[PDB]
């Protein structure tokens, strides 16, 4: 995260770190949506242009974390993966359309002060909140600048951007399964996700019921925190029927 700040303890208790077993390293962010399901970006797991195609046994998830690099004894919980599910129409060839994946854990994780699931939006919460100028929050352990790494989880609040401005900022084809967020050059304030934040959550706190909802997944950007560029996020609500179908049939 660029131009963010250190998270408070327990501020993002749904935040998950996707961790490579060998060599031991951060791969991506992710989020906890129930005691046995973790949501992330498909490109964290499958990206053939970079020879990336992880299997379950390659990976672990670390839940309840704050420090990036420490083993947070008595706080974090480390879970193995039973199964990866990637959206069947994830478009890694062109523009990362439908950049969404689920991971089922081998055993349920116990909730705690530090470990708690985020809500997924209903149609009405999505319609109400996914409006240009409304701010969400992005969290992760990724790089602090495009060209460096945080001690602890970073947080930044960013406004959703009008769809024409998103489209006019890039040559990539934008789809209805994406939204973009960030400040405009004339707005002064700054901030973005960056390398290593992919797969983590874009959340909004509903003013109707005071619950946090995951509206987006950190998906892609061209650089980090560049003027006139914006971060792109997977539109979780638009893909929720697939999420539900996976959970209903494999959970």
């Amino acid at each position: 995260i660029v131009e963010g700040s250190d998270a408070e303890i327990g501020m993002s208790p749904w935040q998950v770190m996707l961790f490579r077993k060998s060599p031991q390293e951060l791969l991506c962010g992710a989020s906890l949506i129930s005691d046995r399901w973790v949501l992330t970006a498909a490109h964290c797991l499958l990206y053939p242009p970079w020879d990336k195609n992880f299997t379950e046994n390659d990976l672990l998830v670390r839940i309840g974390k704050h420090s990036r690099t420490r083993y947070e004894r008595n706080i974090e919980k480390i879970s193995m993966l039973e199964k990866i599910y990637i959206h069947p129409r994830y478009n890694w060839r062109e523009n990362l359309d439908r950049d969404i994946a689920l991971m089922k854990l081998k055993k349920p994780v116990a909730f705690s002060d530090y470990i708690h699931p985020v809500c997924l939006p209903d149609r009405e919460t999505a319609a109400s909140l996914l409006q240009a100028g409304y701010k969400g929050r992005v969290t992760g352990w990724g790089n602090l600048k495009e060209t460096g790494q945080p001690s602890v989880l970073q947080v930044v609040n960013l406004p959703i951007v009008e769809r024409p401005v998103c489209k006019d900022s890039t040559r990539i084809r934008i789809t209805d399964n994406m939204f973009c967020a960030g400040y405009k050059p004339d707005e002064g304030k700054r901030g973005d996700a960056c390398e290593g934040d992919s797969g983590g959550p874009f959340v909004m706190k509903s003013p109707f019921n005071n619950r946090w909802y995951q509206m987006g997944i950190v998906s892609w950007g061209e650089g980090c925190d560049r003027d006139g560029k914006y971060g792109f996020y997977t539109h979780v609500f638009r893909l929720k029927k697939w999420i539900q179908k996976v959970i209903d049939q494999f959970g």
């Binding site: 208790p13 809500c119 947080v155 609040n157 706190k205 003013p207």
Partner: peptide
């Protein structure tokens, strides 16, 4: 979950985090 999105150290104790108000103020 019935309990989703309510943080133990924040909403469940009626404590506010340092920047959540910035989000609320944008919801106009």
């Amino acid at each position: 979950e019935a309990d989703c999105g309510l943080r133990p150290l924040f909403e469940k104790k009626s404590l506010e985090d340092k920047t959540e108000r910035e989000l609320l103020e944008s919801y106009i």
